[PDB]
Design an enzyme around this catalytic site. Structure first.
Site, mmCIF file in Angstrom:
data_model
loop_
_atom_site.group_PDB
_atom_site.id
_atom_site.type_symbol
_atom_site.label_atom_id
_atom_site.label_comp_id
_atom_site.label_asym_id
_atom_site.label_seq_id
_atom_site.Cartn_x
_atom_site.Cartn_y
_atom_site.Cartn_z
ATOM 1 N N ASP A 35 0.820 -1.190 0.000
ATOM 2 C CA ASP A 35 0.000 0.000 0.000
ATOM 3 C C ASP A 35 0.872 1.266 0.000
ATOM 4 O OD1 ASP A 35 -1.737 2.128 0.764
ATOM 5 O OD2 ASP A 35 -3.182 0.672 1.597
ATOM 6 N N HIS B 184 -9.263 -0.138 -8.526
ATOM 7 C CA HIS B 184 -8.844 0.973 -7.666
ATOM 8 C C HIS B 184 -7.780 1.812 -8.384
ATOM 9 C CE1 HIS B 184 -8.523 2.850 -3.662
ATOM 10 N NE2 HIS B 184 -7.213 2.857 -3.837
HETATM 11 C C1 HEM Z 1 -9.872 1.235 1.935
HETATM 12 C C2 HEM Z 1 -9.014 2.208 1.667
HETATM 13 C C3 HEM Z 1 -7.956 2.034 0.649
HETATM 14 C C4 HEM Z 1 -7.122 0.978 0.417
HETATM 15 C C5 HEM Z 1 -7.119 -0.326 1.170
HETATM 16 C C6 HEM Z 1 -6.264 1.335 -0.655
HETATM 17 C C7 HEM Z 1 -5.280 0.485 -1.186
HETATM 18 C C8 HEM Z 1 -4.476 0.821 -2.258
HETATM 19 C C9 HEM Z 1 -3.563 -0.056 -2.885
HETATM 20 C C10 HEM Z 1 -3.267 -1.471 -2.432
HETATM 21 C C11 HEM Z 1 -2.973 0.633 -3.923
HETATM 22 C C12 HEM Z 1 -1.922 0.129 -4.894
HETATM 23 C C13 HEM Z 1 -0.448 0.366 -4.493
HETATM 24 C C14 HEM Z 1 -0.129 1.834 -4.483
HETATM 25 O O1 HEM Z 1 -0.302 2.524 -3.445
HETATM 26 O O2 HEM Z 1 0.294 2.376 -5.524
HETATM 27 C C15 HEM Z 1 -3.544 1.933 -3.937
HETATM 28 C C16 HEM Z 1 -3.220 2.890 -4.854
HETATM 29 C C17 HEM Z 1 -3.801 4.138 -4.781
HETATM 30 N N1 HEM Z 1 -4.795 4.554 -3.970
HETATM 31 FE FE1 HEM Z 1 -5.654 3.590 -2.582
HETATM 32 N N2 HEM Z 1 -6.580 2.560 -1.059
HETATM 33 C C18 HEM Z 1 -7.582 3.061 -0.313
HETATM 34 C C19 HEM Z 1 -8.226 4.302 -0.350
HETATM 35 C C20 HEM Z 1 -7.861 5.303 -1.231
HETATM 36 C C21 HEM Z 1 -8.512 6.546 -1.359
HETATM 37 C C22 HEM Z 1 -9.676 6.960 -0.502
HETATM 38 C C23 HEM Z 1 -7.851 7.251 -2.381
HETATM 39 C C24 HEM Z 1 -8.085 8.601 -2.951
HETATM 40 C C25 HEM Z 1 -8.811 9.554 -2.382
HETATM 41 C C26 HEM Z 1 -6.793 6.414 -2.833
HETATM 42 C C27 HEM Z 1 -5.917 6.762 -3.825
HETATM 43 C C28 HEM Z 1 -5.004 5.845 -4.330
HETATM 44 C C29 HEM Z 1 -4.123 6.254 -5.424
HETATM 45 C C30 HEM Z 1 -4.053 7.615 -6.087
HETATM 46 C C31 HEM Z 1 -3.379 5.180 -5.718
HETATM 47 C C32 HEM Z 1 -2.305 5.096 -6.790
HETATM 48 C C33 HEM Z 1 -2.898 4.579 -8.114
HETATM 49 C C34 HEM Z 1 -1.896 4.711 -9.232
HETATM 50 O O3 HEM Z 1 -1.639 5.815 -9.747
HETATM 51 O O4 HEM Z 1 -1.297 3.716 -9.669
HETATM 52 N N3 HEM Z 1 -6.880 5.225 -2.168
HETATM 53 N N4 HEM Z 1 -4.497 2.012 -2.955
#
Ligand code: HEM
Ligand code: HEM
Ligand code: HEM
Ligand code: HEM
Ligand SMILES: [Cl-]
Ligand SMILES: [Cl-]
Ligand SMILES: [Cl-]
Ligand SMILES: [Cl-]
Ligand SMILES: [Cl-]
Ligand SMILES: [Cl-]
Ligand SMILES: [Mn+2]
Ligand SMILES: [Mn+2]
Ligand SMILES: [Mn+2]
Ligand SMILES: [Mn+2]
Ligand SMILES: [Mn+2]
Ligand SMILES: [Mn+2]
Lengths: 308, 308, 309, 309, 308, 308
Positions: free
Chosen positions: B148, B221
């Site tokens: 994450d 996501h």
């Molecule tokens: C339950 C809550 C969440 C979980 C478990 C979660 C989990 C993850 C995971 C596993 C990734 C892929 C690895 C990485 O960080 O690049 C990711 C990417 C990301 N998450 Fe989350 N996330 C959550 C909530 C959010 C929220 C609320 C936002 C935005 C307001 C967000 C924005 C992002 C963004 C921008 C990426 C990068 C995507 C990319 O450009 O490749 N996430 N998240």
């Protein structure tokens, strides 16, 4: 510079991986390679983020020929293939390579895994022609037993020495790197006394102190690799050499890797080492070290790499 | 970098403390709160200096409403309360918060002690409404089992994405931060195969590799959180999510925290997630994760915070 | 700033070495000294590169008298010998020193080895007149039991406080450093209660929290070392004090070392501590701490130091 | 057991070196080999003492054939060459080896340097026939992506499993070790889903939790390597497998090394894996893993090894 | 030492998890519970083996009542429920608990994950009634600011004090453990001077030196917890106390845990503390600390635990 | 052996403190010293417990004369004062000392603080006659540049070499220790070639490999200190030597400290070094090293120490 590609100025690491590859001839091969190298931050982060310290780095080098295939109409000022050298006793070959990956981390697994993902992503588009798993040996020594890297420039000096500046503005932030895989004759090296060895290198062995001016031989490694211009200004390069070897094949090596904003500095060091200064007065390190490879790469800045 | 408040760009840490507080209605309350936050360097150093590595950091955020009590006729461009979202299946609430303390260190005691001193200094002027003790989980994973934070911008990209620049020069070096405390439905998540979980996230699970373009669902996501503008320019945020949990209350959580120079980026990601792109094509992460809180804060630069 | 001499801004270390030397009177002696200090990056790397972390650092200071011998016609704006002070019961003596080496590292052997190589290169051209092996003591405490360094300015503030800027452009990036070796009277200090000790310092002991306004004595160490000018602007210094001592000699000390872009700030702190503000309201730390040395040095930038001679 | 040879019970390390050598045929060759292995504590300390943690260890194994050359009239009860196996599609070959050095340390340079000194001391009296540089891979995983070593017996159970006791008193504290260098077919393994991989191994992949009874296949690696005798008593082995590989050659491997007080246990595990239980119900790990070597060695206790020749 | 359950003698750790559970009334519940605890080596290794250092440990305790369900006609000599105490000013309650898991590691995630797997394996067979996440606080201190655990027996003394021996040979290598979750009144404690606090504890605060015999109050914690028999023989216990807390709920705690080969020692200390010696001369620690729980468990040897 | 006094078998440490004291003549002095040394576990734990790793150790040695004052009617078999040696070129003085404290830890502050508490507790009852702050120098080297300690016995061998066994049952677990503070002539040492130095010591310098039999001189340090009885059994001692020095006073030292179950082994090594074997063939290390002190102490077991 955390988990950013093309981080030339990273300090020494416990482990490194040096991968040299040749690209395939097709346009498809050219396109796959371009996809991979330009998106290299992808696998860098995929592997690197898993370590809290974030030690993993990856520098991509591109050979002269291959560069011409992907950026035919825009070229850094000093990119050309590695110039073979044929000296009175020793020679430095020029050997193939389109791509360099210079990977470093606190842990071997991070290097290995990044390499694994890169090689896998390149698939049939490229072939590994050289692979070396570098390791730190005691207190920063090479397998000849001397501290190796001591005089590296640091901080502003490192950036001034290694990074392309105003002299070639379209490629600012880039660099040029030369690699040579050296294998040593350990038995011959060990016939020398410690004092003879110190005269070969130019520093004391255990204590890693530069020999006095009046005891510094004119063909010592240090003397031959000191580059001073007509205005009295010294020109330095940034080296990241590592030990490697295989006990069964009696291979004890030093993987040389040197970065400079202008490869003529590095090339002149090599000429002075192999041909001697004056001619014939060559580097006695080469009496115990043979270069198996010799390749020059352009190191694009992050911006330039990302838009290839 | 060391022991300075408002250090938005700090790398990931082993331990974290997220404190969200509401301030008292009175002028004495406003005054205490203002004294504590403008002198936050005090407790930061009092605690942080006791650790040789100086890993302790503290970012203070101020809600829109409280900011108006304390800096009446000067406001950053994009400061407003958190916009709640009401999607086809899932909803993101907007919950109260005047103050955020986002605390990180290599050790829990450092977080706890800084927290304790801030809470004590505030006394009756403010009330804790949310408290989360974040922890690193194995190789930078969240409790869903995925790495994450992988794609976080680093170095210059991190500064360009998170920190206010020329576009709002009275508040340069500040940021906007959104938090949401998510609770997972672990047994539902565990009924998916690894492959289905991967389709939900957008990346392979153990290896943390982005799915191939052809294999990447349009409601993953990763897809929904990729923001590209008309000109083909990507816009990123800086996330510092941490796991938290209570075994007896069966609470398994991800504490989301994201910094951006403009919350429009973060808010668009949240719309794509909760509403879907196209509409109804929402983030399947939300089928296993429920946001218990949702709050937006302005993060003043060190200079702006200290004169307040 | 990895393995670069004159890194004034380096964070606290586990081990330090303070060497103060007097240079010989001859032209030969001066030339040898000049050679060693302007080449100081040599031994710094020779030793420091052997440690993967590259924690080793070395700051060279030069006294006012020695400076005039080796750069007669170019001098930073405020370089002068340490100004001695004498209160009725406590004094800050001015003691000899032409060269300071302030050496820091994660490990003792690294400081020692670099000291060994420097002393060896100087040979008969200089004499060690003070030598202190400093060590981190628990959670950044001095031997009085208080966290020591808490309020140091960090990052930009550290740079703003310690380094010469536009006021003296020929020496931008240099600094002025003062050292004093203090010895403590431990049994007298131990007769105070914790709360009394806290009133002396100005912060709580275990928790290292500044006393609030109504409780902060006008003669606490904190109050007297707070410098706020007429315009209301605070002036800070950058300190890197370490504990030192010898059990058999009953020596328990704090080695004070403070950097400033202008030694007037440090000198005013010392006046306030020793002479008091208002007059006679001195710093009670001095009831338990006696300075055995007092020396001021100019710390040139790398470029200025490398160019010497 | 700090810097002592034959420390079979040492916990997992970050780096390892496996050297397998064949001894020359002459009396001179045998004598040189005898000298080096019975003096092995020499190079072990020469290298290991340089690291404060003292992580370095070295276990010497001797093959059945070589053993008879150097201790003809005294032999542990179960010393014999590796017994080869051939199933219809997978085989465990018996490959040459008189000497094993199983070297472990927190750092690669320590393993390498000790290997260098051992190879150097043997000179022309022995030839390296296998050499593997093992490395820890993430959170104790093998290159198939599974935590590898989980169920190893620890402390008293480890001692009970691995070391010769009362059954063969002249060799108490010795062990029998088997090595196999496995190369993986990574792209075939990658065609399986995670859940399919978990059924092959017998544990969940990320979380390394054993599948429960109703879900545990009769031909999983875990099931076939579980040895429960007629009396209901379980028999364990002590494994220290490491990842190894070469990117350019496309070699991704697991170096299996397993210690047992009686190689019958290890041999029965191998029979079950390769031949199956019931017959033909073999270990599907072998669909993705091919053994390139197979060698058995006796590991003498320190006292027995030191006394050799 | 590594990854074996029932390792009572492990040194102090950075993180801790204390889980106290009550079992279901049914025979199916008893069976699941019995399966989980007798195979606790399973989850211990599943989690613990992922950390190179192998710091993870798990001690399982079983209450008197549940022990009778599971090992009906064989019982250690001193196994009975926790004896509540009703002193002149302060009281120690006896609260429910069938199972204790005392988990320690260098990292919180290791504790949490082992906890998560144990709780999951138990499912509906058992309910968490107390959960405490202990953490090391600065230089081995409790939240009262004193070094906590100084006088613990070590090596042979620790084994002689904590582990059942010849005196009850069917249960050799087992132990008896008492837990009490204490909550502090921090503002009351902070109104004492350091010197008064020292008089309460029995040791100097910063320096952790035992008060001189002549300066040592007869109602100090140290005095009241020193147990010397008729023959002049001292009897010690092994404590593994950890700090815990919640800032928003103003909870500042010491989780007391003490192992002894005979709980009569621990119980006598508790009587001296709560009732006083002489009567009414009670432990002034209790004026700033209130026990929220109190439970006694038997800690079977590894062998006895595994056959159950 | 965690935080236990008299831990003779502890491995090498980064820091140590060697304190030699003389007790006062009065019976009061005798009684204070007895109180302090017999309760030495008190300060050991008071300081040592504050470090999570618990690296601090403290070995108390008692001189022959002083032992007679506190245990007149019970004496270990080989306790006597250090025997001065007067050789053809060099001598080993016998110098005063009633008490030895040999203190080691991962950190200098722990050594210093333990020493501080001991010296303070002894007050006027004793005087420090020698004090040395030992430090680890690079990869376990002494200031002569050689790895120092290599051949130390370990594990069972260490215990057999150093600890009193059946031969003197009333003092089982104890040991005998000799200290000598050596100061080196560094300039003279550095006039030698590395090869000459290797012949003095008996091992190669950088690589720390024992010289071949046929190149091993008969007066090398290694040869003279190899003690083989008439049955061919070697008798080893346990050494904990550390570097020390002062740059201003040109002092570069090796503090020798050696433990043996029978001090005759150590004494014979010293005779062979100073007088030579055969007579006159003395240790050439002594041409560059002068012993400023020489003192023998009995090291009581924990049990014996605690009941003095
Ligand atoms: C339950 C809550 C969440 C979980 C478990 C979660 C989990 C993850 C995971 C596993 C990734 C892929 C690895 C990485 O960080 O690049 C990711 C990417 C990301 N998450 Fe989350 N996330 C959550 C909530 C959010 C929220 C609320 C936002 C935005 C307001 C967000 C924005 C992002 C963004 C921008 C990426 C990068 C995507 C990319 O450009 O490749 N996430 N998240
Ligand atoms: C016996 C020697 C000394 C001792 C034991 C000592 C101790 C301390 C302590 C415990 C603090 C509070 C924590 C901190 O912020 O560092 C402090 C603060 C300070 N000391 Fe010292 N000190 C000594 C000498 C000096 C001298 C000679 C100066 C000035 C020339 C000085 C300048 C300061 C300053 C500027 C502060 C920061 C006060 C603030 O702005 O809050 N100290 N000292
Ligand atoms: C391709 C080579 C191999 C791989 C990748 C491999 C992988 C694994 C894995 C992932 C586990 C589960 C975690 C653990 O408890 O260690 C395991 C368990 C085990 N393996 Fe292997 N293994 C290999 C070869 C062997 C061989 C040749 C043997 C026997 C000669 C063996 C014996 C065992 C045993 C005894 C267990 C413990 C099973 C139990 O009692 O739960 N393995 N192996
Ligand atoms: C509020 C809860 C408690 C706190 C904060 C606390 C704190 C402390 C402190 C600071 C010490 C001195 C350092 C040391 O560990 O040696 C100590 C010692 C001790 N405590 Fe506690 N304690 C608590 C509860 C208990 C209980 C409930 C018991 C017994 C049932 C206990 C038994 C001991 C013992 C035996 C010692 C060692 C005394 C000695 O022999 O010198 N404590 N405690
Ligand atoms: Cl690699
Ligand atoms: Cl916290
Ligand atoms: Cl030093
Ligand atoms: Cl290796
Ligand atoms: Cl936990
Ligand atoms: Cl010390
Ligand atoms: Mn040079
Ligand atoms: Mn992307
Ligand atoms: Mn202030
Ligand atoms: Mn099993
Ligand atoms: Mn006591
Ligand atoms: Mn020998």
């Amino acid at each position: 510079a955390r988990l950013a590609p093309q981080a030339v100025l990273t300090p020494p690491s416990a482990a490194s991986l040096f991968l040299v590859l040749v690209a395939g001839d097709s346009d498809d091969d050219r396109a796959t390679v371009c996809d991979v190298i330009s998106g290299i931050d992808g696998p860098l982060k995929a592997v690197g983020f898993r370590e809290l310290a974030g030690s993993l780095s990856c520098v991509v080098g591109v050979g002269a020929q291959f560069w011409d295939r992907v950026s035919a109409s825009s070229k850094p000022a000093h990119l050309h293939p590695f110039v073979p050298l044929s000296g009175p006793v020793h020679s430095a070959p020029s050997t193939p390579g389109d791509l360099l990956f210079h990977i470093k981390a606190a842990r071997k697994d991070l290097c290995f895994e990044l390499g694994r993902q890169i090689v896998s992503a390149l698939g049939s588009a490229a072939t590994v022609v050289d692979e070396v798993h570098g390791f730190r040996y005691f207190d920063s020594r090479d397998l000849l037993g001397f501290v190796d890297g001591t005089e590296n420039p640091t901080d502003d000096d490192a950036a001034d020495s290694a990074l392309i500046g105003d002299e070639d503005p379209d490629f600012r932030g880039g660099s040029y790197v030369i690699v040579q895989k050296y294998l040593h004759d350990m038995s011959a090296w060990n016939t020398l006394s410690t004092e003879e060895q110190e005269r070969v290198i130019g520093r004391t062995k255990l204590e890693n102190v530069e020999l006095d001016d009046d005891a510094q031989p004119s063909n010592s490694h240090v003397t031959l690799n000191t580059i001073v211009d007509d205005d009295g200004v010294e020109h330095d390069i940034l080296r990241d050499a590592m030990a490697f070897g295989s006990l069964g094949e009696a291979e004890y090596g030093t993987y040389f890797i040197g970065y400079a904003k202008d490869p003529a500095v590095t090339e002149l060091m090599l000429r002075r080492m192999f041909l001697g200064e004056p001619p014939g007065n060559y580097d006695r390190v080469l009496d115990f070290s043979t270069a198996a490879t010799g390749t020059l790469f352009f190191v694009p800045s992050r911006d330039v790499l990302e838009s290839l």
